């Protein structure tokens, strides 16, 4: 929207063609991470942490 285009124009665009969908701990609960795990697809660039 024009107003939003102007707004980012006043504070810097960086209008990346990407969105956001990161896994976040649900509001309310809170605790300690005890174990991470990653099941990669058979034919995909494995991660550093993976």
């Amino acid at each position: 929207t024009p107003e939003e285009k102007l707004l980012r124009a006043i504070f810097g665009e960086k209008a990346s063609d990407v969105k956001d969908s990161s896994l976040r701990v649900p509001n309310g609960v809170s605790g300690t991470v005890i174990d991470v795990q990653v099941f990669t697809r058979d034919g995909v660039e494995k991660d550093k942490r993976a």
């Binding site: 024009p2 107003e3 939003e4 285009k5 102007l6 707004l7 006043i10 504070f11």
Partner: protein
């Protein structure tokens, strides 16, 4: 990968009227959320955004409010470029870009649009 994309075309597929949790009574198509709609919160922020900008361009001069408004195309539908604005204001290109930047210089203290950013 061609086979991978091939398997993404198989099946009817599933119908919404499929029972799932077997509640009283569940339906697959009842869990499908709408996404084309915007949050009432989002719509409210958008309206307040219009008011915010409409009130920010008030603390400007005509030969600066109109410049920013017409350049980035707001409250006038079709947006114009440096030439189409430079012709209607005699001085062409660089001059109008100078003012266009000066208005942005003006917006470095107010917090309204700042918090509206996020």
């Amino acid at each position: 990968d061609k086979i991978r994309k091939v398997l993404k075309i198989a099946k009817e597929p599933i119908s919404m009227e499929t029972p799932i949790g077997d509640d009283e009574d569940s339906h697959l198509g009842d869990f499908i959320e709408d996404t084309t709609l915007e949050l009432p919160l989002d719509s409210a922020t958008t309206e307040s955004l219009r008011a915010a900008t409409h009130d920010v361009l008030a603390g400007l001069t005509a030969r600066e409010a109109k410049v920013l408004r017409m350049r980035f195309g707001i409250d006038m539908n079709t947006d114009y470029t440096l030439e189409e604005v430079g012709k209607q204001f005699d001085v062409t290109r660089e001059r109008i870009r100078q003012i266009e930047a000066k208005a942005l210089r003006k917006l470095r203290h107010p917090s309204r649009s700042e918090v509206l950013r996020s």
